[PDB]
CSV table of C-alpha atoms in Angstrom, one decimal:
chain,number,residue,atom,x,y,z
A,1,UNK,CA,-51.5,24.5,45.4
A,2,UNK,CA,-49.5,24.7,42.8
A,3,UNK,CA,-47.7,21.4,41.4
A,4,UNK,CA,-44.6,20.5,42.2
A,5,UNK,CA,-42.5,17.7,41.7
A,6,UNK,CA,-40.8,18.1,45.2
A,7,UNK,CA,-38.2,14.7,44.3
A,8,UNK,CA,-37.1,12.6,41.6
A,9,UNK,CA,-35.0,9.1,41.9
A,10,UNK,CA,-33.7,6.3,39.9
A,11,UNK,CA,-32.3,3.5,39.8
A,12,UNK,CA,-30.7,1.6,37.2
A,13,UNK,CA,-31.8,4.3,34.4
A,14,UNK,CA,-29.5,4.8,31.7
A,15,UNK,CA,-26.9,7.7,32.2
A,16,UNK,CA,-27.8,8.4,35.7
A,17,UNK,CA,-25.8,7.4,38.8
A,18,UNK,CA,-28.8,6.1,41.3
A,19,UNK,CA,-30.4,8.3,43.9
A,20,UNK,CA,-32.2,10.9,44.7
A,21,UNK,CA,-32.7,15.1,44.5
A,22,UNK,CA,-35.5,17.2,46.1
A,23,UNK,CA,-36.3,20.2,44.1
A,24,UNK,CA,-37.9,23.6,45.5
A,25,UNK,CA,-40.1,25.2,44.3
A,26,UNK,CA,-39.3,27.6,41.2
A,27,UNK,CA,-36.4,27.3,38.9
A,28,UNK,CA,-33.8,23.9,39.5
A,29,UNK,CA,-31.0,24.8,36.9
A,30,UNK,CA,-27.9,22.0,36.2
A,31,UNK,CA,-24.8,22.3,34.9
A,32,UNK,CA,-22.1,20.7,32.9
A,33,UNK,CA,-20.6,19.2,29.7
A,34,UNK,CA,-22.2,17.4,26.9
A,35,UNK,CA,-22.5,13.7,28.0
A,36,UNK,CA,-23.1,14.4,31.6
A,37,UNK,CA,-26.3,12.7,31.4
A,38,UNK,CA,-28.8,16.0,32.3
A,39,UNK,CA,-31.2,15.2,29.2
A,40,UNK,CA,-31.5,11.8,30.6
A,41,UNK,CA,-32.6,13.3,34.3
A,42,UNK,CA,-35.4,15.2,32.3
A,43,UNK,CA,-36.1,12.4,30.4
A,44,UNK,CA,-36.5,10.5,33.5
A,45,UNK,CA,-38.5,13.1,34.9
A,46,UNK,CA,-40.9,13.5,32.2
A,47,UNK,CA,-41.2,9.4,31.9
A,48,UNK,CA,-42.7,9.8,36.0
A,49,UNK,CA,-44.5,12.8,35.4
A,50,UNK,CA,-46.2,11.8,31.8
A,51,UNK,CA,-45.7,8.0,31.4
A,52,UNK,CA,-44.5,9.0,28.2
A,53,UNK,CA,-40.8,8.2,26.5
A,54,UNK,CA,-38.3,9.2,23.5
A,55,UNK,CA,-37.2,6.0,23.3
A,56,UNK,CA,-37.9,3.3,20.6
A,57,UNK,CA,-36.7,0.9,22.7
A,58,UNK,CA,-37.6,0.2,26.2
A,59,UNK,CA,-34.0,-1.6,27.0
A,60,UNK,CA,-32.3,1.7,25.9
A,61,UNK,CA,-33.7,3.4,29.4
A,62,UNK,CA,-31.9,0.7,31.5
A,63,UNK,CA,-28.3,0.6,32.7
A,64,UNK,CA,-25.8,-1.5,30.7
A,65,UNK,CA,-25.9,-4.5,32.7
A,66,UNK,CA,-29.3,-4.5,34.4
A,67,UNK,CA,-32.6,-5.3,33.5
A,68,UNK,CA,-34.6,-3.8,35.5
A,69,UNK,CA,-35.0,0.3,36.1
A,70,UNK,CA,-36.8,2.6,38.3
A,71,UNK,CA,-38.5,6.0,38.4
A,72,UNK,CA,-40.1,7.8,41.5
A,73,UNK,CA,-41.4,11.5,41.7
A,74,UNK,CA,-42.7,12.4,44.9
A,75,UNK,CA,-45.3,15.6,43.8
A,76,UNK,CA,-46.8,18.2,46.1
A,77,UNK,CA,-49.6,20.2,45.3
A,78,UNK,CA,-50.6,22.2,48.6
A,79,UNK,CA,-50.3,19.9,52.0
A,80,UNK,CA,-51.0,17.0,49.7
A,81,UNK,CA,-48.5,14.4,48.9
A,82,UNK,CA,-48.4,12.1,45.7
A,83,UNK,CA,-45.9,9.2,44.5
A,84,UNK,CA,-45.6,8.5,40.5
A,85,UNK,CA,-43.5,5.1,39.8
A,86,UNK,CA,-42.4,3.7,37.0
A,87,UNK,CA,-40.9,0.2,36.7
A,88,UNK,CA,-39.0,-0.4,32.8
A,89,UNK,CA,-38.1,-3.9,31.9
A,90,UNK,CA,-39.0,-6.3,29.6
A,91,UNK,CA,-40.5,-4.1,27.0
A,92,UNK,CA,-42.5,-2.7,29.8
A,93,UNK,CA,-43.3,0.4,31.5
A,94,UNK,CA,-45.2,0.2,34.9
A,95,UNK,CA,-46.8,2.6,36.5
A,96,UNK,CA,-48.0,3.0,40.1
A,97,UNK,CA,-50.0,6.5,41.2
A,98,UNK,CA,-49.8,6.4,45.3
A,99,UNK,CA,-48.8,2.6,46.0
A,100,UNK,CA,-51.4,0.9,43.3
A,101,UNK,CA,-51.2,-0.3,40.1
A,102,UNK,CA,-52.1,2.7,37.7
A,103,UNK,CA,-53.0,3.2,34.3
A,104,UNK,CA,-51.4,6.4,32.5
A,105,UNK,CA,-55.2,7.3,32.7
A,106,UNK,CA,-54.3,7.9,37.1
A,107,UNK,CA,-51.4,9.8,36.3
A,108,UNK,CA,-53.1,13.4,37.0
A,109,UNK,CA,-52.3,17.7,35.9
A,110,UNK,CA,-51.4,17.0,31.9
A,111,UNK,CA,-48.0,16.5,33.9
A,112,UNK,CA,-45.0,18.3,32.1
A,113,UNK,CA,-43.6,19.9,29.0
A,114,UNK,CA,-40.4,19.4,27.8
A,115,UNK,CA,-39.3,21.5,25.1
A,116,UNK,CA,-35.7,20.1,23.2
A,117,UNK,CA,-33.1,20.7,21.2
A,118,UNK,CA,-33.9,19.1,18.2
A,119,UNK,CA,-37.0,20.7,17.9
A,120,UNK,CA,-37.0,22.3,14.6
A,121,UNK,CA,-37.3,18.9,13.4
A,122,UNK,CA,-40.8,19.5,14.2
A,123,UNK,CA,-40.3,22.0,11.7
A,124,UNK,CA,-37.6,20.5,8.7
A,125,UNK,CA,-38.1,17.2,9.8
A,126,UNK,CA,-41.0,14.4,8.5
A,127,UNK,CA,-44.7,13.8,9.1
A,128,UNK,CA,-44.5,11.2,12.0
A,129,UNK,CA,-42.4,13.5,14.7
A,130,UNK,CA,-45.0,15.8,14.1
A,131,UNK,CA,-48.2,13.3,14.5
A,132,UNK,CA,-45.6,12.2,17.4
A,133,UNK,CA,-45.9,15.9,18.9
A,134,UNK,CA,-50.0,15.6,18.3
A,135,UNK,CA,-50.2,12.3,19.7
A,136,UNK,CA,-48.4,13.0,22.5
A,137,UNK,CA,-49.8,16.1,23.4
A,138,UNK,CA,-53.4,14.5,22.8
A,139,UNK,CA,-52.4,11.3,25.1
A,140,UNK,CA,-51.7,13.9,28.1
A,141,UNK,CA,-54.8,15.8,27.8
A,142,UNK,CA,-57.3,12.7,27.4
A,143,UNK,CA,-56.7,9.1,28.8
A,144,UNK,CA,-59.3,7.8,26.1
A,145,UNK,CA,-57.4,9.5,23.3
A,146,UNK,CA,-54.0,7.3,24.4
A,147,UNK,CA,-55.9,4.3,24.6
A,148,UNK,CA,-57.4,4.8,20.9
A,149,UNK,CA,-54.6,5.3,19.7
A,150,UNK,CA,-52.3,2.2,21.2
A,151,UNK,CA,-55.7,0.2,20.0
A,152,UNK,CA,-55.7,2.0,16.3
A,153,UNK,CA,-51.8,1.4,15.9
A,154,UNK,CA,-51.9,-2.8,16.5
A,155,UNK,CA,-55.0,-2.7,14.4
A,156,UNK,CA,-53.4,-1.0,11.2
A,157,UNK,CA,-50.7,-3.1,11.9
A,158,UNK,CA,-53.0,-6.4,11.1
A,159,UNK,CA,-54.1,-5.1,8.4
A,160,UNK,CA,-51.4,-3.8,7.2
A,161,UNK,CA,-50.0,-7.7,7.2
A,162,UNK,CA,-53.0,-9.2,5.8
A,163,UNK,CA,-52.5,-7.0,3.0
A,164,UNK,CA,-48.4,-7.7,2.8
A,165,UNK,CA,-49.2,-11.4,3.2
A,166,UNK,CA,-51.0,-12.2,0.7
A,167,UNK,CA,-53.8,-12.6,2.4
A,168,UNK,CA,-56.0,-9.6,1.3
A,169,UNK,CA,-59.1,-11.5,1.2
A,170,UNK,CA,-58.7,-10.9,5.1
A,171,UNK,CA,-57.8,-7.6,5.0
A,172,UNK,CA,-61.4,-5.6,6.2
A,173,UNK,CA,-61.9,-7.5,9.0
A,174,UNK,CA,-60.9,-5.1,11.3
A,175,UNK,CA,-62.7,-2.1,9.1
A,176,UNK,CA,-65.2,-1.2,12.0
A,177,UNK,CA,-62.8,-0.6,14.3
A,178,UNK,CA,-60.4,1.5,12.2
A,179,UNK,CA,-63.5,3.5,11.1
A,180,UNK,CA,-65.0,4.1,15.0
A,181,UNK,CA,-61.3,4.5,16.0
A,182,UNK,CA,-59.5,6.5,13.3
A,183,UNK,CA,-63.1,8.4,13.7
A,184,UNK,CA,-62.3,9.6,17.1
A,185,UNK,CA,-59.0,10.1,16.8
A,186,UNK,CA,-59.3,12.7,13.6
A,187,UNK,CA,-62.1,14.6,16.0
A,188,UNK,CA,-60.2,15.0,19.6
A,189,UNK,CA,-57.4,16.4,16.4
A,190,UNK,CA,-59.8,18.6,14.8
A,191,UNK,CA,-60.8,19.9,18.6
A,192,UNK,CA,-57.6,20.3,19.7
A,193,UNK,CA,-56.2,22.4,16.6
A,194,UNK,CA,-58.3,25.5,16.7
A,195,UNK,CA,-56.6,26.3,20.1
A,196,UNK,CA,-53.6,24.8,18.7
A,197,UNK,CA,-53.6,27.4,16.0
A,198,UNK,CA,-54.5,30.7,18.2
A,199,UNK,CA,-52.1,29.6,20.8
A,200,UNK,CA,-49.0,28.7,18.7
A,201,UNK,CA,-50.3,31.9,16.0
A,202,UNK,CA,-49.7,34.1,19.4
A,203,UNK,CA,-46.6,32.5,20.3
A,204,UNK,CA,-45.0,33.2,16.8
A,205,UNK,CA,-45.7,36.7,17.3
A,206,UNK,CA,-44.9,37.1,21.1
A,207,UNK,CA,-41.3,36.1,19.8
A,208,UNK,CA,-40.6,38.7,17.6
A,209,UNK,CA,-42.0,37.1,14.0
A,210,UNK,CA,-43.8,39.5,12.2
A,211,UNK,CA,-45.2,36.6,9.5
A,212,UNK,CA,-48.0,34.5,10.8
A,213,UNK,CA,-48.0,31.0,11.9
A,214,UNK,CA,-51.2,29.2,10.9
A,215,UNK,CA,-51.3,24.9,12.0
A,216,UNK,CA,-53.7,22.7,9.9
A,217,UNK,CA,-54.4,19.3,9.6
A,218,UNK,CA,-53.8,17.1,6.3
A,219,UNK,CA,-56.5,14.8,6.5
A,220,UNK,CA,-56.5,11.7,3.8
A,221,UNK,CA,-60.4,11.6,4.9
A,222,UNK,CA,-62.9,13.0,7.0
A,223,UNK,CA,-65.4,11.4,9.5
A,224,UNK,CA,-67.8,11.8,6.7
A,225,UNK,CA,-66.3,9.7,4.3
A,226,UNK,CA,-64.4,7.6,5.9
A,227,UNK,CA,-66.3,3.6,5.8
A,228,UNK,CA,-66.4,5.0,2.3
A,229,UNK,CA,-63.2,5.9,1.2
A,230,UNK,CA,-61.8,3.1,3.4
A,231,UNK,CA,-63.3,0.3,1.8
A,232,UNK,CA,-63.3,2.3,-1.9
A,233,UNK,CA,-59.3,2.4,-1.8
A,234,UNK,CA,-59.3,-1.3,-2.1
A,235,UNK,CA,-57.3,-1.4,-5.4
A,236,UNK,CA,-55.0,0.9,-4.3
A,237,UNK,CA,-54.3,-0.4,-1.6
A,238,UNK,CA,-53.6,-3.7,-3.0
A,239,UNK,CA,-51.4,-2.0,-5.5
A,240,UNK,CA,-49.2,-0.4,-2.2
A,241,UNK,CA,-49.8,-3.6,0.5
A,242,UNK,CA,-50.8,-0.4,2.5
A,243,UNK,CA,-53.6,0.6,4.4
A,244,UNK,CA,-53.9,4.8,2.7
A,245,UNK,CA,-56.7,5.9,4.9
A,246,UNK,CA,-57.3,6.8,8.8
A,247,UNK,CA,-55.1,9.4,10.9
A,248,UNK,CA,-51.5,7.9,10.5
A,249,UNK,CA,-51.6,8.9,7.4
A,250,UNK,CA,-51.7,12.7,8.6
A,251,UNK,CA,-50.3,15.6,9.0
A,252,UNK,CA,-50.1,18.7,10.8
A,253,UNK,CA,-49.3,21.5,8.2
A,254,UNK,CA,-47.3,24.5,9.5
A,255,UNK,CA,-48.2,27.5,7.5
A,256,UNK,CA,-45.5,30.9,7.7
A,257,UNK,CA,-46.5,33.8,6.2
A,258,UNK,CA,-48.3,31.8,4.0
A,259,UNK,CA,-46.1,29.8,2.9
A,260,UNK,CA,-45.3,25.6,3.9
A,261,UNK,CA,-42.9,26.7,6.9
A,262,UNK,CA,-40.9,23.1,5.9
A,263,UNK,CA,-39.4,24.9,2.2
A,264,UNK,CA,-38.7,28.4,3.4
A,265,UNK,CA,-38.9,29.2,6.8
A,266,UNK,CA,-35.3,30.3,7.4
A,267,UNK,CA,-33.4,28.4,10.5
A,268,UNK,CA,-34.4,30.8,12.8
A,269,UNK,CA,-37.9,31.3,11.6
A,270,UNK,CA,-38.1,27.2,12.3
A,271,UNK,CA,-36.7,27.8,16.0
A,272,UNK,CA,-39.4,30.2,16.1
A,273,UNK,CA,-42.1,27.9,15.3
A,274,UNK,CA,-40.8,24.7,17.2
A,275,UNK,CA,-40.9,26.5,20.0
A,276,UNK,CA,-44.3,28.6,19.5
A,277,UNK,CA,-45.5,24.8,19.1
A,278,UNK,CA,-44.2,24.0,22.9
A,279,UNK,CA,-45.4,27.2,24.6
A,280,UNK,CA,-48.8,26.6,22.6
A,281,UNK,CA,-48.8,22.7,24.2
A,282,UNK,CA,-47.9,24.0,27.3
A,283,UNK,CA,-50.4,26.5,27.6
A,284,UNK,CA,-53.0,23.9,25.7
A,285,UNK,CA,-52.4,21.6,29.1
A,286,UNK,CA,-52.8,24.1,31.5
A,287,UNK,CA,-56.5,25.6,30.1
A,288,UNK,CA,-57.2,22.5,30.1
A,289,UNK,CA,-56.5,21.7,33.6
A,290,UNK,CA,-55.9,24.6,35.2
A,291,UNK,CA,-52.8,23.7,36.6
A,292,UNK,CA,-49.6,24.0,35.2
A,293,UNK,CA,-47.4,21.3,33.8
A,294,UNK,CA,-43.3,20.7,34.5
A,295,UNK,CA,-41.8,22.9,32.7
A,296,UNK,CA,-38.4,20.7,31.4
A,297,UNK,CA,-35.7,23.0,29.7
A,298,UNK,CA,-33.7,20.8,27.9
A,299,UNK,CA,-30.1,22.6,27.0
A,300,UNK,CA,-31.3,26.1,26.8
A,301,UNK,CA,-27.3,27.2,25.6
A,302,UNK,CA,-28.1,25.6,22.7
A,303,UNK,CA,-30.4,28.4,21.7
A,304,UNK,CA,-28.2,30.8,20.2
A,305,UNK,CA,-30.6,33.9,19.6
A,306,UNK,CA,-30.1,36.5,22.6
A,307,UNK,CA,-33.9,37.4,22.4
A,308,UNK,CA,-35.1,34.4,22.3
A,309,UNK,CA,-32.6,32.5,24.8
A,310,UNK,CA,-34.0,35.0,27.5
A,311,UNK,CA,-37.4,34.0,26.9
A,312,UNK,CA,-36.8,30.7,27.4
A,313,UNK,CA,-35.6,32.0,30.8
A,314,UNK,CA,-38.4,34.0,31.8
A,315,UNK,CA,-40.3,31.2,30.5
A,316,UNK,CA,-39.3,28.6,33.3
A,317,UNK,CA,-39.4,31.4,36.2
A,318,UNK,CA,-42.6,32.0,35.0
A,319,UNK,CA,-43.6,29.2,36.4
A,320,UNK,CA,-44.6,27.2,39.6
A,321,UNK,CA,-41.5,24.8,38.6
A,322,UNK,CA,-39.3,24.6,36.0
A,323,UNK,CA,-35.4,22.0,35.6
A,324,UNK,CA,-33.7,24.0,33.6
A,325,UNK,CA,-30.6,22.1,32.1
A,326,UNK,CA,-27.5,24.1,30.0
A,327,UNK,CA,-23.6,24.2,29.7
A,328,UNK,CA,-24.0,26.9,31.8
A,329,UNK,CA,-26.1,27.8,35.0
A,330,UNK,CA,-29.3,29.7,34.7
A,331,UNK,CA,-29.2,32.8,36.7
A,332,UNK,CA,-31.9,33.5,39.5
A,333,UNK,CA,-32.2,29.9,40.2
A,334,UNK,CA,-34.0,28.7,43.6
A,335,UNK,CA,-31.5,25.6,43.1
A,336,UNK,CA,-28.2,25.0,41.3
A,337,UNK,CA,-26.8,21.6,40.3
A,338,UNK,CA,-23.8,20.5,38.9
A,339,UNK,CA,-24.1,17.1,37.0
A,340,UNK,CA,-20.7,14.8,36.0
A,341,UNK,CA,-21.0,10.8,35.2
A,342,UNK,CA,-24.9,11.1,36.0
A,343,UNK,CA,-24.5,12.6,39.2
A,344,UNK,CA,-26.2,15.8,40.4
A,345,UNK,CA,-24.8,18.0,43.2
A,346,UNK,CA,-25.0,21.2,44.6
A,347,UNK,CA,-22.9,24.3,43.8
A,348,UNK,CA,-22.8,27.6,46.0
A,349,UNK,CA,-24.7,30.4,44.2
A,350,UNK,CA,-24.0,33.6,46.3
A,351,UNK,CA,-26.8,35.8,44.6
A,352,UNK,CA,-29.4,33.1,45.6
A,353,UNK,CA,-27.5,32.0,48.9
A,354,UNK,CA,-27.3,35.7,50.9
A,355,UNK,CA,-30.6,35.5,52.7
A,356,UNK,CA,-29.6,35.4,56.4
A,357,UNK,CA,-26.3,35.9,56.0
A,358,UNK,CA,-25.5,38.3,58.4
């Protein structure tokens, strides 16, 4: 009855040998050398499960010499099978759910969470990365949000081009649209913030921090003054050649023991905060859907703190299903695979295959 990714197949997907893999309930551990394509399997899974990608360019996902790629996820929730497919090519990501052309919205239970070895950049990196964290999560929570955000981004782009091209007389043509969409986006973010703050605070504590982690939003405007602010900062926007009002300008502020984490958190504290953000993402999806997202744990061996590494492995064992990669096998997994040159092959684990041996 839990959801499960029962199989993943790819063809022409960057750094993956074409083929299929069948995954059991519980943890599938995958080990191999740096460069064997482990992260790309997780990326492909995340794409099939959520319709999202880290790639700045879709062509980056397609094997050299090929012009299209294909990913297929088989999902089993109870006795119900579902099929999620993604076709890639020509800058385009085409989804299908159960054989029918689909929008992102027809994808179900907050499909996956992908914990990534670069996640400390959420703490120490630029505002754009924290907007991407929030936008990604909120788009998984709500189809409407994803559509609004997409339309908003394109509309801001037109406004900014009007400014930069010296067509400032024409700059306000879409301000009604930006008001409406910008307000909805800001409000969705405020709604989620209440729970994300609580969830990240708890995860940070459970990870052993004795400092309080708090999330707040740094906002360019408010719903109540958005229209006034938008229009009222014209002189500034003419000077800058850019739009200075709206959620594309905002940030998720991370405060740890009353100081800005970006500037005062140690490297270890930063790793803990970043993991707390992923745990809060997981739990917020779980609370919304009463359905556990598939956990994609990318390079657990890159976590060099024993306790925090063990937390990741325990979390993976705790959920109905996780796919865990690293340079060595995750102990106790339902299935273990070795990654070589983008090909995944089972290996024996005598500790987990001792049933029916007598």
